[PDB]
Amino acid sequence: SPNIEACGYSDRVLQLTLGNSTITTQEAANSVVAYGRWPEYLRPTEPDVAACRFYTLDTVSWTKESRGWWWKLPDALRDMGLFGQNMYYHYLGRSGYTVHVQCNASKFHQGALGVFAVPEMCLAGDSNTTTMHTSYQNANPGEKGGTFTGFCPVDYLLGNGTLLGNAFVFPHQIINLRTNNCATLVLPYVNSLSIDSMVKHNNWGIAILPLAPLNFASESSPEIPITLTIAPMCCEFNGLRNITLP
Amino acid sequence: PSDTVQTRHVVQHRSRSESSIESFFARGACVTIMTVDNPASTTNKDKLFAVWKITY
Numbered sequence: 001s002p003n004i005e006a007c008g009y010s011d012r013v014l015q016l017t018l019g020n021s022t023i024t025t026q027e028a029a030n031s032v033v034a035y036g037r038w039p040e041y042l043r044p045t046e047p048d049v050a051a052c053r054f055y056t057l058d059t060v061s062w063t064k065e066s067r068g069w070w071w072k073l074p075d076a077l078r079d080m081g082l083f084g085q086n087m088y089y090h091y092l093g094r095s096g097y098t099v100h101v102q103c104n105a106s107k108f109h110q111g112a113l114g115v116f117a118v119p120e121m122c123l124a125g126d127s128n129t130t131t132m133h134t135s136y137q138n139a140n141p142g143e144k145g146g147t148f149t150g151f152c153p154v155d156y157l158l159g160n161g162t163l164l165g166n167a168f169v170f171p172h173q174i175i176n177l178r179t180n181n182c183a184t185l186v187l188p189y190v191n192s193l194s195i196d197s198m199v200k201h202n203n204w205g206i207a208i209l210p211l212a213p214l215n216f217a218s219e220s221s222p223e224i225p226i227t228l229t230i231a232p233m234c235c236e237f238n239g240l241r242n243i244t245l246p
Numbered sequence: 247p248s249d250t251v252q253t254r255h256v257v258q259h260r261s262r263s264e265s266s267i268e269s270f271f272a273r274g275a276c277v278t279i280m281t282v283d284n285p286a287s288t289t290n291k292d293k294l295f296a297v298w299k300i301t302y
Contacts, residue, residue, distance in 0.1 A: 017251065020248060
């Protein structure tokens with residue numbers, strides 16, 4: 001689906017400095033808007049830059065054995081400064097996400113990463129009658145995240161009971177080592193309501209699985225790191241409660 | 247406030263007159279100590295004159 005061919009190497013280093021953050025993106029161009037919609041305001045307190053700035057999660061090692069990785073939103077960013085706060089001090093909250101996944105290697109490494117953003121991504125446990133099942137804490141692995149396997153999400157079953165090959169229905173991009181180094185996914189707020197409670201309900205779900213294995217030239221770096229930078233877009237929350245300071 | 251773009255620097259001058267060249271050396275410092283004397287006796291070493299080459 002993502003049959004693009006920007007250039008191949010590197011051209012232009014154009015940094016995204018929003019608020020306090022700074023990114024220095026590989027370029028800027030080549031981004032996918034989920035379903036063709038930009039995160040908009042409810043048609044409330046709009047913090048903007050205060051909440052709307054780049055936060056970086058923990059970097060994870062990609063290896064010749066890796067089966068995949070997964071995170072939840074806003075869940076992961078629950079331990080992020082002002083966005084971490086505003087999440088616990090309000091009963092409401094809707095937010096967009098600029099999932100900017102970067103992965104650098106050399107002209108000598110080969111493989112392919114597919115960043116899949118699954119809206120309402122519940123994980124594997126074939127009890128249709130009683131879903132949710134796995135405890136609040138397991139279902140929410142924070143900023144460190146969870147991982148796929150060959151709480152148990154099977155890779156070819158996308159960790160939900162449906163053949164991986166059809167995953168390509170959800171918004172995605174393929175970080176193919178020989179071409180792109182970056183993945184840009186703007187995910188607008190998707191839920192059954194106009195606004196809801198962030199602490200309990202998980203909107204999206206970033207799942208990066210390997211479509212091609214990792215092969216490194218003779219002897220080189222045994223593993224390569226993948227980084228996930230996420231940012232809250234056009235967010236609002238109602239309404240401050242006894243700023244119950246922890 | 248908090249900021250680390252990459253601009254030139256930030257703002258313009260802020261008063262730097264006492265740091266300028268002329269003002270940096272406007273102070274006179276000791277350069278040497280010459281020792282003469284008016285002896286009545288024949289002291290050929292300290293003999294009236296004292297010679298010093300002008301050097302910082």
